[PDB]
Structure formats: structure tokens, C-alpha cells
Amino acid sequence: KVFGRCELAAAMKRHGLDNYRGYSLGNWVCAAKFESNFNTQATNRNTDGSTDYGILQINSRWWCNDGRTPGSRNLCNIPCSALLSSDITASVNCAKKIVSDGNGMNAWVAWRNRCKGTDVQAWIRGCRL
Ligand code: NA
């Protein structure tokens, strides 16, 4: 599924991401835009052989099991394919574990480079929330 901006904001709000660990909703919307262009089916392979999955590009080295990333952990205890669903619940739930891991939203390289320090409230402007 390719979300609209406000549709995703709403879904994220409903699933408790607004101000989760102090990160306002615009931060999560901005991260999703630049990580996946709001497409739940996005995948990208990394040099190390791991793959990033779904709207928040969650990596198979640590977070989910794809069956082809040797010695990886599966800290979210889910097949990576679950992260490609039109239902963002699994992605949101795993994201909450990641953002709690010590480095906050710096775990998302697109967030760090393209959202951090910018006016992220812009991402939710206009929306009915
Ligand atoms: Na894994």
C-alpha cells in the first residue's frame, strides 16, 4: 500500500507513535517519507547482505528474520515479510523497540540526514488528526 501523508499520520497516531519517546508525529511521517516514500512494500538490500523492509525500512541483521541474513537476530520476533503488510501494526510495534534501544531515531539514517533539525511539523500540516 502506498499511503497518503495524512492517512499515514492518522494511522501512526492511532498506533501510539505521537510523542513516543519524545518524538512528535511529524518526525515519524518524515522518516517514512524518506525511508520508503510511504510504500509498505519497499525493500532495499545492504552491502552486508541484510535487507531493509517496509515503510520504516527495518533491517534484518537485528530486527526481523528473512531466512537469508546469517547470524542475525530477530529482536522483534517477526518474519520480515510481516513488515510489508498494508497494516502497519507490526512495523510500528518493532519501531517502538528500535527507538527505545539507546540511539533514538538516529537508528534511521534518512531521519538523521533529512528530518533531524528541520521543521517536521510541516509533515502533519493540513491533516485532520
Ligand atoms: Na535477522
Q: Which three cell numbers stand for residue 8?
A: 499515514
The answer to the question of whether 101 is labelled as a binding residue is yes
The length of the chain is 129
Cα 110 from Cα 11, distance rounded (Å): 21
| Catalytic (active-site) positions | 35, 52
CA dist., res. 122 & res. 30, Å (int): 9
Angle between helices 5-14 and 25-36 (to 10 degrees): 130
Helix locations, the chain, DSSP H: 5-14, 25-36, 89-99, 109-114
Percent helix, strand, coil in the chain (nearest 5)? 40, 10, 50
Spatial neighbors of 124 by CB under 8 A, at least 6 apart, are 6, 9, 25, 26, 29
Positive/negative CA dihedral, 45, 46, 49, 52? negative
User: What resolution in angstrom units was achieved for this structure?
Assistant: 1.5
Q: What is the CATH number of the domain that holds 3?
A: 1.10.530.10
- How far is residue 17 CA from its own chain's centroid? 11
Residue span of the structural domain in which 1 resides: 1-129
Cα of 27 from ligand 1 centre, angstroms: 26
Q: Ligand 1 centroid to 124 CA: how many Å?
A: 33
| Count of alpha carbons within 13 angstroms of residue 42, beta-carbon side | 21
Q: Which amino acid is at 16?
A: G
Domain count for the chain: 1
Structure-solving method: X-ray
Between the CA of 127 and the centroid of ligand 1 the distance, in Å, is 36
Smallest CA-to-CA distance from 120 within 32, 24, 33 is with 24
Edge to edge, the sheet with strand 58-59 lists 43-45, 51-53, 58-59
